[PDB]
Structure formats: structure tokens, C-alpha cells
Ligand binder design. Sequence first.
Ligand SMILES: [Mg+2]
Ligand SMILES: [Mg+2]
Ligand SMILES: [Mg+2]
Ligand SMILES: [Mg+2]
Ligand SMILES: [Mg+2]
Ligand SMILES: [Mg+2]
Ligand SMILES: [Mg+2]
Ligand SMILES: [Mg+2]
Ligand SMILES: [Mg+2]
Ligand SMILES: [Mg+2]
Ligand SMILES: [Mg+2]
Ligand SMILES: [Mg+2]
Ligand SMILES: [Mg+2]
Ligand SMILES: [Mg+2]
Lengths: 202, 397, 152
Amino acid sequence: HRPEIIVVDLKDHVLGRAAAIVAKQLLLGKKITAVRCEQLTIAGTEIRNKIKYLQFLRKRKLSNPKLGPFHHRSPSDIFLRTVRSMLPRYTKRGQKALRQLVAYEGIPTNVVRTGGRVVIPKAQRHYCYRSERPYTVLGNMCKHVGWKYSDVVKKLETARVEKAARHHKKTEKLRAAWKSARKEALSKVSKNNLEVLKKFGY
Amino acid sequence: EHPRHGHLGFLPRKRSRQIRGRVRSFPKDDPSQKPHLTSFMVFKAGMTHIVRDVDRPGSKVNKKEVVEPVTILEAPPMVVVGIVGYRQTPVGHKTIGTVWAHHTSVEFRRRFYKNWKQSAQLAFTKRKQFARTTEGRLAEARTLKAFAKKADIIRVVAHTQLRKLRNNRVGVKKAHVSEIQINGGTIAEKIELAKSLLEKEVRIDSIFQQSETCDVCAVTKGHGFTGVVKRWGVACLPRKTHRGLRKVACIGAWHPARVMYTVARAGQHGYHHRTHLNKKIYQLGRAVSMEPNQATTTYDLTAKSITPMGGFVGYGTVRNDYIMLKGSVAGPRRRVITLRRPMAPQTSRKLTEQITLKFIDTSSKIGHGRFQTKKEKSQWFGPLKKDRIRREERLRK
Amino acid sequence: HYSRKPQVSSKSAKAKVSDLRCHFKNTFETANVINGMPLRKAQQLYRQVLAKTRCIPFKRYNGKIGRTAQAKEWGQTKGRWPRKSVVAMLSLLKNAEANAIEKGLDPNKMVIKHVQVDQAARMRRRTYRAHGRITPYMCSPCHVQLFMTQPQ
RNA sequence: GGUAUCGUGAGGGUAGUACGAGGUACUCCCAUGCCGUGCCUCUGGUUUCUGGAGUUUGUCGAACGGCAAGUGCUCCGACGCUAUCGCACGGUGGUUAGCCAGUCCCAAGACCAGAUGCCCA
RNA sequence: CGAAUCGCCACUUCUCUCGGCGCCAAGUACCUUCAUAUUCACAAGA
RNA sequence: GUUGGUUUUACCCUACUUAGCUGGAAAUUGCGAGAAAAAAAAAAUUUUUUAAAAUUUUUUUUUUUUUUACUUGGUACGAAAAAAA
RNA sequence: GUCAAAACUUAUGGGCUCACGAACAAUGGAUGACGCUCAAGCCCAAUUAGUGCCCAUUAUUCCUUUGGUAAGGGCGAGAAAGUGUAGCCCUUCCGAUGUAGAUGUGGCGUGGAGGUAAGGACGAAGCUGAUGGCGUGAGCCUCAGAUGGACCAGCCUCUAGUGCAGAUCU
RNA sequence: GCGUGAGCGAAAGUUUGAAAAGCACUUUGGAAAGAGAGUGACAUAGACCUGAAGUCGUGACAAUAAUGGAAGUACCUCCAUUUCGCCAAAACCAGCCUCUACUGAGCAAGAACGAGGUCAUGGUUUUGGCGGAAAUGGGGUGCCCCCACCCGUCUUGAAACACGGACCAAG
Ligand SMILES: [Mg+2]
Ligand SMILES: [Mg+2]
Ligand SMILES: [Mg+2]
Ligand SMILES: [Mg+2]
Ligand SMILES: [Mg+2]
Ligand SMILES: [Mg+2]
Ligand SMILES: [Mg+2]
Ligand SMILES: [Mg+2]
Ligand SMILES: [Mg+2]
Ligand SMILES: [Mg+2]
Ligand SMILES: [Mg+2]
Ligand SMILES: [Mg+2]
Ligand SMILES: [Mg+2]
Ligand SMILES: [Mg+2]
């Protein structure tokens, strides 16, 4: 059994727009599973954004940092904090919605090969940034800010890709069959249907 | 204004959650190296001093004998009893699994109990009967495939042999188990060292060698709810002070309107974990039965033993292999102190120095002890009344 | 009388000690331990707690009471060993096994079913404090009542 | 589900510093100061081992042995505690001295589907 | 233990810059069961 | 200008400092189901090896008990027999 | 844009902008937060595009109340010539906040009295109350006591030592 | 009772019951007391009418800054009423609301047809659902979302780091 999760693929999405759209859907009950939070982008040079983060990291309770604001450095933990800042995080409605979100760096093997991955066109980088303006890929800035697993994830991302690609041509004979099988299906007994398929573009 | 009283990176100053002094971080793996173990549990015995000829260009002591204190650390061989693999994850290392040795010394299985001898003593009983079966042999076989595949870290699970320690004061009979990382070559190389070594003893002399340094980690000696003057080193107040002298007079200000984590306060001092660095190994020492003339240096030929005349106070004879390393070691006598391979660069002119001892000391600790030898004490006093009241009895028999 | 009537009059023994002159707070603790216990294991807990072999788990009337390792038995760190209150409890449990015996009931099958130490009317006495003051001292004697059915 | 064991390490803490001499004007050395983390072999201090001795007055009839003097007092005194008054130690990598990471310290309320042992009426 | 949930799939479930099917006959031939569950009412079914 | 001239209370709350205990993943509830898991098994993606014969019996393998190498007292492999798969 | 209702980030609008930007030196930290950068910024204009939406104790409208020393009609159970009640009935209209303060009240409630009417050992007062019911409300009433044990509510008139969270009140 | 004194100066209802009939006797306890038994109409009338609050103990139960408001919902209701009517849904009518002209393609511009919505609008039933229970209402407890600065006070200004404020009863 799996619940109606939708695994948003967060690569090359604007951090705060994707965080804003996702933060809304969690309220509307969607059980999202962000992945590739390493790949979230931010406007500006990395230096703009490291300094923004290092001004964040600069904030701690002097009395006892131990209980102070916590400066998570995982791009995913950074995306969860970004997305909990956009939902009623103290009411249970929002504390609940935040637990319905599961960020991951990369795309983890439990979440791969589970179903198609969604995308947020309103949060696409090309949709948002002016293309020639500089941009900060998120897992890249946070590598410089303390995240230690930036290369662990890239080694993993390399593996799922080389693996997914091997399976994409393991199945090339198969997909090629249905393409051929389906094209010759039109030639089959579906006669009057062949005209109802021509209309509508099938 | 003066500097702060105390290091804030050693904080909270709380009781350690263990006592075995487990290594916090092993020195970084170097593939170029051949595989080796990175640490070794040892029991602090006591201290002595040694004479040595420093031969260090520069200083006023080059070519001159210097008396270094040394800690003696009895080191009965540890036994490997299982391998452990770690796989790197974006969230951090996960154990892949462990392969336990086909057999386990009871001292080890004592460790899984609070009352072994009133227990059914079933620990590793299913493993013993299952690792035997081909079903469980193939399962053990698969774990090693997972190591050779998914692992980044191979670690032996070794333990101390307290049975072999024969110390009368270290009351434990539960073995001191601990993973000991295998830095070395390729993971198959580490697995191979790991499994050939999977039920064998492991002497320190293999892990360490003389003049090389070792990081030590042991919980430091416990002092209970120590006061702020002993805990932090703050100045005690002038006699005329009312409420009491031994206090920080000002534990805060108006704002921030609360005591900060940085002001010193009474509480636990001692019995904290510590990793102290760069302790030179003045000698590995073989067990007294095997190599009786311990502490007999090239320049001090009398047959002798690393243990003082009264034995080590509170500990007694070092019946086993002993590491003898320069200076203090954290922890009370007879505490178990893990000591790893150095994590420092160790290319220092000092650290690389070969250490040829000129005189291990063996005088009594207890009193001043002006004799190096029980034979030499008798050679001073000669016969005395205990003997005449002994010698006479022998003649009558 | 009793806050709770026994389920089966013939099968239970009742016992009580009004204006018991032991501290309420200590007796409150001491009697509540017993509330579900079989009488023999409750005779026992007291004989053992009277030996400092086990403790009465103080629960509500902790206060800045000291930690003991004999309280692990009861799920908490604080525990305590009233003697004046443990003896009064044995002495009230003797009262019921006596009451239980006369009913033809068997005391060693009998189970404590209801313990209830109400706080009794208090006795005044006087302090004599610093600058000419006279604050109260007051004992807080307890009303303990209980019954103990045996299972049918 | 218990119990137990080994670990993970998000997060948080975080520290080394200065001076001098040498060597040749960087490197490289060698000491020290401060700081810090310990430790107690040595050396010093500490004695309620009132240990051993000496000793004063009272006292036990006396010697012996004590005893009282709130530890009578003086000498020596182990264990232990402790002193920069002794001693050992104080490590890197990446980015723009900083800074971050590490080493170092606490570390699952960071709820670790990490591993593992045992039993699961 | 009665539950809320109401598409699935190794044709999406790779990467980097109209996925297939399913929707009442395993199929385009309507063979063929459906009532009274009596015009909404949580789908009374998964 | 000079001189003399009672400095009280925490045992509360929080901060903090150590020190414990116990719960908890619908953060105590729902059964409201998401794993940084895997997607016949192991070894060198494909091939070969691991109960068989008519539920019970037989055979094989492993472990425990009895009669050299490990730091050297106590555990391992040796043997032989019995039990379990 | 999210928090946050609404542009599920609208425009089939214009410019400008790379680093800040969004009416009235010292505990770490504030466009409100996040975050935003072909803006989620600024100036301008817009409203589905050369063929808007969201939120008031506001407005309008509807229901109800109350007030009007406001406007009229009327006189199966009711129809009272009425300031005010459980309002004589119906209709329409306008008003409604409010400290100090003023006033009204067939307004509430208390001890007592003149009356009236009635109740009570088949249980008065008192007290208890997931006892409901009624009243805008002060409150009243009923139920139930596995409460009590002997007094007493209604109504009109009279009376007052008459209503209490707060006085460092006793 | 207080004060050397002059003087100050309480609290206290024996209101158990009709009557003492004031709990004999048994039983445990050293006792106090307890368990039975007995008296009485009642002893939760026991030396005591009533028997409040607050406080506490206990059982059971719901549960997880406080309180609080609004609205629901979950569960419970020793409550009320009603039904043997209650919940619904659709329709009809009314109401109500929404959705040419000029100009040189534009407006400063006017209706119409048609359709929709709606009872927290009025009147017309219809049709089904439910019926020891159902049903509406109330009450209780929890939750959810939302709203919500401790009151009294003097003061221009109080949530104030301004004063008074532990609880309750009688006054
Ligand atoms: Mg003073
Ligand atoms: Mg010594
Ligand atoms: Mg105390
Ligand atoms: Mg205490
Ligand atoms: Mg006096
Ligand atoms: Mg259904
Ligand atoms: Mg749970
Ligand atoms: Mg919105
Ligand atoms: Mg008004
Ligand atoms: Mg009066
Ligand atoms: Mg109530
Ligand atoms: Mg008055
Ligand atoms: Mg009474
Ligand atoms: Mg003023």
C-alpha cells in the first residue's frame, strides 16, 4: 500500500516559488515528496546567497545556542525550513502539512521507480529567471556552507542515472514493440473507429 | 579584562555516557597504505618515569638524558569477533550489517548481560547454530558481498580479554567490546584483513610500534559535582566576601536577562571524554612471562619488570603486554583507554623521533622507594630479623 | 463511611483508622501503593519497606524529596521509607485480616480493593519564630479506610 | 514488543595564542609565556593511616600500656588529593585574517527502517 | 474493525533541452445478467 | 572640610549548571498505510547449484564430548558419535 | 506567491532595475516572516486584452429585538379603548455604540409588615445538581437528591440595617 | 485571657434525639480504635440539626500558560420536547438577484430575448428517508479551525517594568 503521494522533482526550480506552491498544496492536503532539492536554484550569484545564509547562520541564542534557531545545511532541510516558513507552522493544520512533505537530496531509491515525477512550471527556473542573470543552484551554495554530503549525493545521482539509463535501453526492444504493435493496430479491424481516431488526432 | 576561564568546546561538562573511551573519529583512510587496525583498547596501570637521551638539534638538552614520566598501559590482546561495514548515505553512514565470529569468548558474551551467571546465557546462541548451517553461511556470505560492494568503512568489532588481563582490581569480567576501524587499501583488502583476523587475537605491537604516537581517548577521572573554582579555574573571592568565596561573583548582567551558557557554574567535573593527541610510544612491552626482562634497557642491564616494587598502586602487576607512552594519560588507574592511530600529521621533528630508553624506573610508588629492585633492597638491608626468624625455622625442619 | 462499597459484602473485609496520628502525606503515599495489591504482598511490601529493602514510591507528595534507586520498581525516581506510616498500615491490615477471618473469609486470598487516606482534622501546636512571632505547627493526621475482597 | 549491545551524527558547542632565540630575508628549527585539555612518575603542599616517634601537664597505685588537653603539642609520614609549585598534550581541509567544514565536546525531541544479540506466554 | 481515502502500469517510473491504458462484452459484434435498492441522499460497491 | 556611623530574604518561577526518570512518529488518537530498503539466490546479467521417493525415511553435515596456533587454563579446528535438517 | 481570503504566481501591458527594493555600534533578528529578481521590487496603466478578485460592526436588502413623548388602521384561539406586563391586535417608518452623569422600567432580587391567594410530614426552608425550561438580562421555574426535617412561595401595598471578586477591607 | 498599672477583654448555640433508647455483647487491637451486633423512624442523627463554598481523598471517565469567544464536530447525556411528526430532495407561483440611439469603427449609449441562481424570502404541496426507539433542542467532555493582552484603579495614556489582586464563606 502506498498513499496518494506526488513526488515533485525540484531540479532547476526557483527555491521560494517552488517552496510557496508546494507549501500551499500541503495545506490542500497533497502529500508531496520533494526530490533533488540539491538542484533547487536561487536568484543571484552563489556569493549573494552564501552571504544571505551566513547571515542566517550568524543568528543564534547567546544564552544557549543549543536551543537557538537551527541552521540546517542540507538543501532538503533548507527546503523544508523554507516550506515550513510558508505554512501555519504552529497550528496543527500546518505542523501536519509540513510532515506531509518529504524532501530528499537527489532522488532516493525508494522514491525512484515509484511513478512519474511532477514538476512545477510556475517554479521553473527558465520561467522565472531572466536567463542571462546569474543564479545559485542550491546544493552548490550549501556545500560551501557546511553540507557534507554534496558529493555523496552526486555519486548517488550518478548511479541512479547510469542505472536508469541502462534500463532505458533494456526496454528499448519493449517500447519499440508497442510502438510497432500500436501503429499496426490502426490497420486492424478498427475501421469506422479509424475515422473517429483521425478526428481528434489519434 | 582577562581571557575567558575554560574551553567552551569541552561542553557540556557532563559525565561521559560511556567509560570505555570509544574513538570519536578514526584517522582518514589512506588507500595507498596496506590495511591495518586503527585503535586498541588498553588498561591504564600507573605511571613511572624514564631516562632518555634527547638527540634533537637545537635546545639545551640535545645529547642529554632527560627524565620523562611515562604511563604504563597493560594491553592484553584484543580479540576480533565480528566485522562491520558502513555504507555512505546522504544522511550519513549506515551499518550495512555485521558478520559475527563463529565463536565468541564468554568474556565477550558477558558483555550482553548484567548478570551473566544467573542468566540462561543464550547470547549468540542462535548465531552459533545458524552460522554453522549452510543457510546461515550463505547469509554471512551475502553480508560480505554487501561490504565489498556498498561499504566505505570496514570495522572490526574487537574486545578486551579481561580473563587474560588477570588484574585483581579491574573488576569487570564483561568484555570491553568496540569497533576498531580498518584503514588501509581497497574494501576487499579491508574485508580480507577483517575476515582473516575475524577470530584471532590482535596484539598492540601489530597496531602500533615504538616512537610512533597515539591519540588517546578515555573518560577522565571523575570529581563529582565539582565547584566552579575547580571546574573552571575562576578566582575565588577575597576573604571579606560574605555569601562565600568560591563563586563567580557575577553570573550575568541585566541583559541578556538570564545566565548565559558561557558563565561558569558548579557541576560535574571529571569523567569527561577526551581525545588527547600525540603521545609518543616509548615502548611496546611483551608479557612478563614471555619477555621477563622488561625495563631492562641497553644501558641498564639488570633483569627487571615494568611493574614497580609494590606493584602499581591500586592496580598491581602488569602481567601482559604493555604500551608505555610518554606523559599522562586521561583516566584513573585501571580504566580502559582506547588509543587510536594518530590523526595529526605526525611529520613533526619531535613526533618522528626514535626513543631509545636509557632507564625505565621501577622504584616503589608508595613511599619514595629508593630501590629499583626487590633484589637490590635486600642487597641494601642484607639479611634481617624476618630472615633470621625464617632461616632458623628451616634449619629445625 | 467508605467511599466505595465493596462489590460483595460477604466476600470482603473492611478496616479503618480515623484520626490516625501519622503524617497525611506520608500515609497518603504508603496506602496508595497497596490499593491494588493482594494482602500478603502488601503485608510484604511493608515488611520490606520497613527494612529499607524497598521504598514507598512517593508520587503526589514528592516535593523536594530525595531520589532513591528503590523507586525504580514504581516507575519513578523519588521514593521514601515512612516507618510510622508503614507500621500504621500493617496495623490496619492486621485489622482487616482479622475482620476478614471472622467473616469466614481467607485472608491470604484476600485482595486490597480500596484504600483511601483522607486528611483528618488537624492538631494545632505553636512555633516560636524569630522576631517574637508564633507561627503554627500542625500535625496532619490521616483517615485511612480500606476494604479487601477475595475473588470468587 | 521487551531487553541488550555496537554504532550513525542531523543539530549545537568549538581554541589555541603570543613572544624570543637559532638558522638563512620566507622556509626550517628550538625554548618560553599565556590559554586550554588532562595526569600525579618525580618535586612541592596537604595527614583524621591521630601511621610511627618524641614530648608537656592531668590521670589510670607503678612500670608497661594508655588516656584527657574538643586532633595537647613537636618530628617524620604513606594512600590520596593537588600545584604552571610537578608533568604530558594542544591536528587539518575548503572557500572569501575572516568564514565554513573537520579534527575536538554533547550528540535521535534529528524520535536512526542503522546494524546487531536474546526471548517473543 | 464500522470506518475517511476512490486511477492503474516494469508502454510514465532515464537523462538532457497527448506516456500507455482505464471509463461496462478482454471488444465494436450489443451476444448479454441487472428491476422491488421501489426519483438525491457515504459507491449499499472497491 | 573632618571624624564615627545595622548592607536583610530564594525554600518560588525562569535562566543556567550538572543529575536522573518516562513517554512519544495523526508527536500520546485512526485502523490516516510515505523507508535516503529491497524490488531462487549467489557467484563469476546469466548460469549453476541447492531432499528424494512413494509425509516419511535416509543420508549427510555439523557440533559436542571424550580421550598445532593462538598470551600460555581455554577457546579453535583434529575423532567419533549422535542429532537435526 | 506562502503564511492569508483573493491574480490555483492574471495581463494576450509599458518602462526601469543586479544590490539593493517594497503613507502617517555594541544579547541574534527582522520589507511582518519566508522568500522574491523576465519580482513576489519600482513608476505607470489595466481587468481577461488592440475583441477581474478578496476581506468590515460599513452600504444596501431580509429576518428579529428594542426605542420613538413615531405614522396609521382596528377592537382552533383572541379581539383589553390600552404609557409600562406574557406588551389589546395588526401595519409601516426611523434610531440603536458609549466613560463621567442623568432618567426610565406592571424591571430583577432580599429581610420584614398590611392584604389576598395558596402550599407543606404523600416532606417547608436550606442546600446539591451534564434538571432542563423560560427571560436580552438581573433572574425565575421545573426535575432530581439514593438532601433535609417544618415551615412557606405567589400576587398587590407597606417597609428596610436590602444585592458585593477587589477597600494592604473585617 | 492580657497589662506593673490605669485599664483592655474575647471566643463559645451541647440546636443528638420524641425519649439516652447515649452503641450492651462478639471480634481484632497494647491501646486508640476497627469489624459485626444493637438502639432509634433516621447514627452519612454517635456527644452529634442543617452540613454550602473552598480544599482534599477516592472511584470511574474523557482526555491532553490556563481561562476565554465563535463555530462546528467527535463521544456522552439520571435532560427536554416531539414523533410512531423528523431529515431530506424536487417541483410551482411570487418576489429577488445575477447573466436601439448617437457618433466617426467609437460612445458620455438604450432596452430586449433567453437562461441561471435562490427560501437565512413568500406562499403552494409533492416525493422519499427515519420512526423499544428515532428525532430536534439543551447539557457535558475533547478536538479541530479561528478570535482573544489579567482584572480593579487613578490617569492624556494600563498588558504595562504603576497601584490592589492566593481560595472560599459571612459581613
Ligand atoms: Mg561581610
Ligand atoms: Mg606514589
Ligand atoms: Mg533539599
Ligand atoms: Mg531532595
Ligand atoms: Mg520574645
Ligand atoms: Mg461507503
Ligand atoms: Mg501511536
Ligand atoms: Mg490563499
Ligand atoms: Mg446606549
Ligand atoms: Mg432587617
Ligand atoms: Mg458542575
Ligand atoms: Mg447593608
Ligand atoms: Mg451534623
Ligand atoms: Mg501620569
